[PDB]
């Protein structure tokens, strides 16, 4: 079948400026027949562009396709915080009707520090065996943060996940979350939990920590 | 308006099988072609079926032809995708869409999650991530931790949806004993703690778990 091939496949652009972003086809894609879509976070796709030039209702005028055979192009022109999305494009002449592989546009914004807070495990975890302690780094930019667990000034890996927040798409800034799981048993045995977090945006490593069971 | 709701999505054992459903409203329905879209979780969008107007016709992609089955009830407005002999590679979001031209797609649905595992269906336990007011600044956070369900997905809303600023639910992660697990927090007043209330409400709905957990500064 057709292949769709997109780039770039990433992009990262501040507000104001203007995204270009490519659709090249393996085969001619007849008539007209290239569609554009913007996926945000959590959202089903909408559709931008079709006829590869057409803008769909309610698409605002900054979208705007071009190309015709197998070259073709989407450019949006004065980005905004919300423009934050996957955009796809799409053949429809043939079946299967072909998707490229997306570009994902990152909206730039400036520096920002993460805050940090750490949670440490319920009493009512404790109770069924295990215990989960909670570093959470909220509301930061760029993307890139480095967390390092600490048990009694000891490093931990591997019993440690982290989880990543989309794009907040008003103010563009990441959360992130940092859970380090152990036996309830473990747990008792330390006394000083710490996370250990840096970021471009702080001047110097930022550490929360708390002292089990004091409060 | 134009709207298209999927039902039906949840768990599914391998070589199982699976019915999905979408109501549609706001347009004439016996006046288009409809399709199913899907996107596997982290990856593209992939056409599956397409039936016309009058459902005696359907087109179905390779990988699915003679598995699925796409048929339309045009006296009650409602898509279905006969699903069977499920296999992981099916594991997706579902979206119904509506079909113009010779296939680009105006509307979409929300979409509906269809998982494909041997594993069964398990409701969350929920623990308070409590505020303090101490060992907090930049003011106060504090949080559900949403441990131990299958499959995706679950919901958290705060104070039944009265609290939606500065809330951040992160995406689930898959813990190493095949069980997902989240966290959902929210940054407050330092001053309003004792005073406001916080309370989280999950939601699972492949197992029927309902939590609510009242979020309070320990003692």
């Known amino acids: 079948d057709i292949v769709m091939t997109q780039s770039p496949d990433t992009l990262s652009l501040s507000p104001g400026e203007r995204a270009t972003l490519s659709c090249r086809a393996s085969?001619?894609?007849?008539?007209?027949?290239l569609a554009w879509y913007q996926q945000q976070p959590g959202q089903a796709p909408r559709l931008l562009i079709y006829?590869?030039?057409s803008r769909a209702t309610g698409i605002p005028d900054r979208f705007s396709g071009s190309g015709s055979a197998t070259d073709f192009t989407l450019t949006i022109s004065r980005l905004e915080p919300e423009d934050f999305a996957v955009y796809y494009c799409?053949?429809?002449?043939?079946?299967?009707?072909?998707f490229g592989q997306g570009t994902k546009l990152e909206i730039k914004r400036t520096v920002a520090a993460p805050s940090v807070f750490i949670f440490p495990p319920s009493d009512e975890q404790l109770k069924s065996g295990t215990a989960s302690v909670v570093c959470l780094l909220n509301n930061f930019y760029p993307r890139e943060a480095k967390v390092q667990w600490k048990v009694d000034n000891a490093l931990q890996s591997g019993n440690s996940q982290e989880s990543v927040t989309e794009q907040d798409s008003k103010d563009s800034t990441y959360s992130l979350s940092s859970t380090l799981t152990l036996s309830k048993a473990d747990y008792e045995k330390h006394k000083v939990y710490a996370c250990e977090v840096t970021h471009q945006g702080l001047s110097s490593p930022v550490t929360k920590s708390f002292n089990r069971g004091e409060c | 308006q134009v709207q298209l709701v999927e039902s039906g999505g949840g768990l599914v054992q391998p070589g199982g099988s699976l019915r999905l459903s979408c109501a549609a409203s706001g347009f004439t329905f016996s006046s288009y072609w409809m399709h199913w879209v899907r996107q596997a979780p982290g990856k593209g969008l992939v056409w599956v079926s397409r039936?016309?107007?009058?459902?005696?016709?359907?087109n179905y992609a390779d990988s699915v032809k003679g598995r699925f089955t796409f048929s339309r009830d045009n006296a009650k407005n409602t898509l279905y995708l006969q699903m069977t002999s499920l296999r992981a590679e099916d594991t997706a979001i579902y979206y119904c869409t509506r079909g113009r031209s010779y296939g680009f797609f105006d509307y979409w649905g929300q979409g509906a999650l269809v998982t494909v595992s041997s594993a069964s269906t398990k409701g969350p336990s929920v623990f308070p991530l409590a505020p303090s007011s101490k060992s907090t600044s930049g003011t106060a956070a504090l949080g559900c931790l949403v441990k131990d369900y299958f499959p995706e997905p679950v919901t958290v809303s705060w104070n039944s949806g009265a609290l939606t600023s500065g809330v951040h639910t992160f995406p689930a992660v898959l813990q190493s004993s095949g069980l997902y697990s989240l966290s959902s927090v929210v940054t407050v007043p330092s001053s309003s703690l004792g005073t406001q209330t916080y309370i989280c409400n999950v939601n699972h709905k492949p197992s029927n778990t309902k939590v609510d957990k009242r979020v309070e500064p320990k003692s």
């Open positions: 799409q053949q429809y002449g043939t079946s299967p009707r072909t």
């Open positions: 039936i016309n107007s009058d459902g005696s016709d359907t």
């Open positions: 006829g590869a030039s």
């Open positions: 085969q001619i894609i007849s008539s007209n027949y």
